[PDB]
Every structure is written in structure tokens, then in C-alpha cells.
Amino acid sequence: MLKQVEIFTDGSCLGNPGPGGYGAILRYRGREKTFSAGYTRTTNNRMELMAAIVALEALKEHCEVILSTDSQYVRQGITQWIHNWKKRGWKTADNKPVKNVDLWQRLDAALGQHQIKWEWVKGHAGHPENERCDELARAAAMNPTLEDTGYQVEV
Numbered sequence: 236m237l238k239q240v241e242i243f244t245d246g247s248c249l250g251n252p253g254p255g256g257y258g259a260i261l262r263y264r265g266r267e268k269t270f271s272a273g274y275t276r277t278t279n280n281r282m283e284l285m286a287a288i289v290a291l292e293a294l295k296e297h298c299e300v301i302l303s304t305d306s307q308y309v310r311q312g313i314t315q316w317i318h319n320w321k322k323r324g325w326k327t328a329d330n331k332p333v334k335n336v337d338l339w340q341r342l343d344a345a346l347g348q349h350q351i352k353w354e355w356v357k358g359h360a361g362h363p364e365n366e367r368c369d370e371l372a373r374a375a376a377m378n379p380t381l382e383d384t385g386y387q388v389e390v
Contacts, residue, residue, distance in 0.1 A: 237262055240300040240349075242290045243361075244309075245368035246282030247376050252386060255279060256375025257286040258368035261293055268293060271371040273379030277386050280308045282372065284338040291345035303354040303365060310355050312339060337385035 241262040248255030256273035270289045274282070283306040294300075304310075317339070320326075325333050325340065333339060356365055 236265055238299075239352075240294065240298040241364075242287070242300060242302040243364035243368050244283070244286030244290060244302065244304045244306065245365060245372045246279060246284070246286050246306065247369070247372035248277060248279035248282055249376050252276045252278055252388075254376050254379045255282040255383075256372045256379065257282045257289070258371025258375065259286045259290040260364045260368060261290045263294065263298070269371070271375045272381055273375035273377070274381050274383040275379045277383035281335055281338060281383060281386060282376075283308050284312075284335060284342055286368070286372070288338065288342050288345060291342070291349070294345075294349065297349055299350045299352075301352045301354060303356055303362065305356045305358045305361055305365060310353070313353060317343065332390055334390070335385070336390075 243260040244257065246255065246257045254273060254275055255277040256271060259270045261268045261270070287302065287304070287309060320333055320339070325336050327333055356362070
């Protein structure tokens with residue numbers, strides 16, 4: 236039985252905007268849970284955030300987590316933007332709501348319930364679970380069933 240929760244995520248999109256999906260693998264309690272869903276009209280960045288969101292929201296108590304992903308967008312947000320956005324009330328320097336504020340706020344909320352260790356893998360050198368995520372994200376994008384409500388050409 237692992238002593239740390241392990242999470243792997245990937246997101247994919249055929250266009251901008253386009254049909255997209257995510258894949259996430261969660262090792263929790265004594266199981267391996269797999270999540271995957273495709274959205275009719277979304278972006279790659281929104282799917283990459285969605286992957287992390289869904290995996291974290293499955294956690295029902297405060298856990299010690301290790302999350303592994305090759306997502307540049309998630310890494311950038313986590314390491315350079317988030318901190319400064321919370322100080323600013325989630326606005327850009329020209330005073331508008333940040334891009335994908337809906338998902339970043341949602342993620343932030345899930346983050347605050349746990350002790351997280353982030354592992355930034357390179358696309359060509361991730362574990363077997365990251366490749367698997369990529370395959371599920373891609374398959375999902377080919378057969379989308381949900382609507383990405385928070386997507387805006389806009390804000």
C-alpha cells in the first residue's frame with residue numbers, strides 16, 4: 236500500500252478551440268482509479284487543468300500527494316502566476332479576470348486541502364502512467380460527450 240497519493244495527468248485538444256479531452260490516473264486507498272472525458276469545444280490548456288482538477292476532487296481527506304505531468308501551462312501557473320494572482324484578486328495587469336480563472340480557482344480550491352509535491356516530467360521521458368494518460372486524453376478528444384461551460388473566446 237503506497238504511503239503517498241500518486242497522480243498522473245495529461246490533456247489534449249484537436250483545435251483552438253476544438254474537441255478535447257483529458258486522462259488522469261490516481262493511486263488512492265488501495266486502488267488505481269482512471270478518469271477520462273472528451274469535451275466538444277475546448278482548448279489544450281483547459282483540458283490539462285481539468286485533468287488535475289478531477290483527480291484532486293476525488294480525494295475525500297487531506298492527503299500527501301505527488302502529481303506528475305509534462306504540462307507546461309500547469310507548471311507555469313503553479314510556479315510563476317498563481318501566487319501573484321491571489322494577491323491581485325485574480326486579475327491581469329490591465330485589470331481583467333485572468334484567462335481560465337474558472338478552472339484555476341477550482342484547482343486552487345482543491346490544492347489547499349492537501350500537501351502537494353509536483354513532478355515536472357518531459358513529454359518524451361515520463362513514466363508509463365503519463366503515456367497512458369496521453370493515450371486516454373487523445374481517445375477522449377475523438378469522442379467528446381460533455382460541454383466545457385467555462386470556455387470563452389473572450390475573457
